């Protein structure tokens, strides 16, 4: 996909998952922009597994799935953000396994990978 149709799918993918919680929409703004110094709620929580669930990069016991998520990248991000991906994929395979509850864990990982992002990073 292009540049312009993953931001635009960012919207889209936020649709999806959003309805389900309980949300404040300046903590949204904030992982939109990769910001994730900031503590999560549950409810926060719980949404990045439900993005991660429709990604299709963790499970319903919020694994992260490496080998999965680098077969997923060309249908989740453009090729710009193909190479910080592979990396934050890499550095961040093992964060799920500090946690035990499923929605923690996918919230860690994507916390990891803004962290790791070495370039700008977006969070539906």
Not at 22 to 44: A, C, H, I, W, Y
Not at 113 to 118: L, M, V
Request: some cysteine; hydrophobic content about 35%.
């Amino acid at each position: 996909m292009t540049m312009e149709q993953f931001l635009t799918s960012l919207d889209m993918i936020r649709s999806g998952c959003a309805p389900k919680f309980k949300l404040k929409t300046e903590d949204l703004d904030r992982l939109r922009v990769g910001d994730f110094n900031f503590p999560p709620s549950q409810d926060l929580m719980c949404y990045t597994k439900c993005v991660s669930l429709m990604a299709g990069t963790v499970n319903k016991k919020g694994e992260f799935n490496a080998p999965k998520a680098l077969a997923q990248l060309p249908h989740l991000v453009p090729p710009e953000m193909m190479e910080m991906s592979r990396k934050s994929v890499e550095a961040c395979r093992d964060t799920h396994k500090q946690f035990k509850e499923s929605c923690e864990r996918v919230y860690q990982t994507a916390k990891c990978f803004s962290e790791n992002a070495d370039g700008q990073f977006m969070w539906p």
